[PDB]
């Protein structure tokens, strides 16, 4: 939109098999995994996503309180499980300027990986703009 | 404008079935009673590709061999507007469901009368 700009958000994921586990050969290892949502500034650099007021990790429903609300930075979550799954990361702009959803795949193929997502961020509203203008040139 | 989730349930054993449903306030699958018509825009190789279903349930039975992308055109009641769902037909699962979040107009009195049976309005 000519009333929005493109902003890249980054999901940084980590996971490791928990050491010292008593598991048989046909049984799944438990892993400590973690995810954090960052923002890319105009240079390509990781910065705090200060244009978001709230972030929700919609975990797989086998977890309990699977709707994990994060009302403040940092938008970090860590957890223990055995399974890979796709999750909604529901992100809310500051200034009540709207929301978007990132569909992120939690996978255990690497020790750490990052995935980038492009979003249309509105640049018409004043309160969101004062924060956006710290990272991007707005029309 | 409020958010309503439309869900397409596809089955196959190919005798494949599709049925457009919607999620109510609790997340239970219910028939999309907020829709006038629901046309399934099949692939051209089928005869009479446009399948107009004037009444509920919006449920089709068909036999085929290929996997195609399918337009599910949905009209709101009281001529409140249109929207299209892009559903891909696949065969490596005997059954699956896919959700689609749609913006529904909140300024058509006839449409919100049926909308109000299920959700609260702004």
């Amino acid at each position: 939109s000519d009333h929005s700009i493109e902003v890249t958000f980054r999901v940084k994921t980590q996971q490791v098999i928990i050491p010292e586990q008593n598991i048989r050969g046909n049984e799944l290892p438990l892993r400590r995994w973690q995810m954090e949502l960052l923002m890319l500034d105009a240079t390509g650099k990781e910065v705090e996503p200060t244009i978001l007021s709230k972030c929700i990790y919609h975990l797989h429903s086998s977890f309990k309180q699977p709707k994990r609300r994060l009302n403040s930075l940092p938008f970090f979550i860590k957890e223990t499980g055995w399974g890979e799954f796709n999750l909604k990361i529901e992100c809310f702009f500051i200034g009540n300027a709207g929301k978007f959803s990132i569909e992120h795949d939690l996978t255990f193929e690497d020790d750490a990986y990052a995935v980038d997502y492009t979003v249309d961020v509105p640049h018409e509203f004043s309160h969101l703009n004062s924060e956006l203008s710290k990272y991007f040139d707005l029309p | 404008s409020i958010e309503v989730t439309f869900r397409v349930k596809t089955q196959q054993v190919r005798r494949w079935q599709m049925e457009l449903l919607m999620l109510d306030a609790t997340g239970k699958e219910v028939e999309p009673t907020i829709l006038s018509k629901c046309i399934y825009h099949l692939h051209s190789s089928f005869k009479q590709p446009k399948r107009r279903l004037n009444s509920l349930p919006f449920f089709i039975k068909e036999t085929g061999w290929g996997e195609f992308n399918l337009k599910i055109e949905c009209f709101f009641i009281g001529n409140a507007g249109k929207f299209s769902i892009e559903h891909d037909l696949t065969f490596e699962d005997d059954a699956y469901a896919v959700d689609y979040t749609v913006d529904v107009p909140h300024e058509f009195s006839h449409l919100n009368s049926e909308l109000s049976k299920y959700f609260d309005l702004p």
Partner: peptide
């Protein structure tokens, strides 16, 4: 809530405490 397929799946990559 009845789940759609994408949110419903949970999958396991490997068994055993061995990193592949």
């Amino acid at each position: 809530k009845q789940l759609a397929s994408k949110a419903a799946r949970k999958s396991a990559p490997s068994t055993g405490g061995v990193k592949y």
